Amino acid sequence: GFVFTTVKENPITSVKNQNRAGTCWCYSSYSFLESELLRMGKGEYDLSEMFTVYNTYLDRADAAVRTHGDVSFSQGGSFYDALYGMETFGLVPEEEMRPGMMYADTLSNHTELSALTDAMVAAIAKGKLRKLQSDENNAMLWKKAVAAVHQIYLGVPPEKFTYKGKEYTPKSFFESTGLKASDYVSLTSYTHHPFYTQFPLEIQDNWRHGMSYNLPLDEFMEVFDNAINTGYTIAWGSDVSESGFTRDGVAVMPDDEKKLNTKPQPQKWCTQAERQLAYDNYETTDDHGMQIYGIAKDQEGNEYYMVKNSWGTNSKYNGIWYASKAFVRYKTMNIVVHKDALPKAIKAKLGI
Which residues of this protein are in contact with ligand T1O, per CB under 6 A?
18, 20-24, 76, 109, 111, 288-289, 311
Output the known binding site for Zn(2+): 24, 288
DSSP secondary structure string for all residues of 242-293: STTB-TTSEE--B-S---TTTS---B-PPPHHHHHHHHHTTSS---EEEEEE
Residue 24's binding partner, choosing from ligand T1O, a copy of itself, K ion, none, with beta-carbon cut-off 5 to 8 A by kind?
ligand T1O
Q: Which ranges in the chain belong to alpha helices (H)?
A: 24-40, 49-66, 79-88, 111-125, 141-154, 170-177, 217-229, 272-280, 325-331, 344-348
Task: Sort residue 167 into left (φ over 0), alpha (ψ -120 to 50) or beta.
Answer: beta
Residue 242's binding partner, choosing from ligand T1O, K ion, a copy of itself, none, with beta-carbon cut-off 5 to 8 A by kind?
K ion
Q: Which residues bind K ion (CB under 5 A)?
A: 46, 94, 239, 241-242, 283
142 Cβ neighbours under 8 A, 6+ residues apart:
65, 120, 124, 132, 133
Task: Tell me if 96 sits within 8 A of 51, measured CB to CB.
Answer: yes
The one catalytic residue among 110, 150, 288, 338: 288
Residue 257 lies near a copy of itself (rule: CB under 8 A): no
The number of angstroms, rounded, from the C-alpha of 328 to the middle of its chain's C-alpha atoms is 15
Residue 172's binding partner, choosing from ligand T1O, K ion, a copy of itself, none, with beta-carbon cut-off 5 to 8 A by kind?
none
DSSP label of 238:
E
- In the complex, what is the shortest distance from the CB of residue 196 to a copy of itself, in angstroms, rounded to a whole number? 18
Residue 94's binding partner, choosing from ligand T1O, K ion, a copy of itself, none, with beta-carbon cut-off 5 to 8 A by kind?
K ion
State which residue, 21 or 91, has the beta carbon closest to ligand T1O: 21
Instruction: Indicate which single residue of 11, 44, 46, 103 sits in contact with a copy of itself (rule: CB under 8 A).
Output: 103
Segment contacting a copy of itself by CB under 8 A, of 81-89, 96-104, 303-311, 328-336:
96-104
Task: Tell me if 237 sits within 8 A of 332, measured CB to CB.
Answer: yes
Catalytic annotation on 309? yes
State which residue, 136 or 165, has the beta carbon closest to a copy of itself: 136
- In the complex, what is the shortest distance from the CB of residue 181 to K ion, in angstroms, rounded to a whole number? 19
- Which are the residues after which the chain is interrupted (C to N > 2.5 Å)? 258
Amino acid at 91: L
State which residue, 89 or 224, has the beta carbon closest to a copy of itself: 89
DSSP secondary structure string for all residues of 167-217: EE-HHHHHHHHT--GGGEEEEE--SSS-SS-EEE---GGGTT--EEEE--H
Residue 111 lies near a copy of itself (rule: CB under 8 A): yes
Segment contacting a copy of itself by CB under 8 A, of 3-11, 121-129, 220-228, 287-295:
121-129
Element (H, E) at 336: strand 332-338
φ, ψ of residue 75 to 5 degrees: the values are -70, -25
The one catalytic residue among 24, 214, 270, 338: 24
- In the complex, what is the shortest distance from the CB of residue 111 to ligand T1O, in angstroms, rounded to a whole number? 4
Alpha-carbon distance 28 to 115, whole Å? 24
- In the complex, what is the shortest distance from the CB of residue 159 to ligand T1O, in angstroms, rounded to a whole number? 28
Contact residues for a copy of itself, defined by CB under 8 A: 63, 66-68, 70-72, 102-104, 109, 111-112, 115-116, 118-120, 122-124, 127, 129-136, 138, 140-142, 144-145, 148-149, 152-153, 200, 202-204, 207, 209, 273-274, 276-277, 280-283, 314
Report the catalytic residues.
Answer: 24, 288, 309
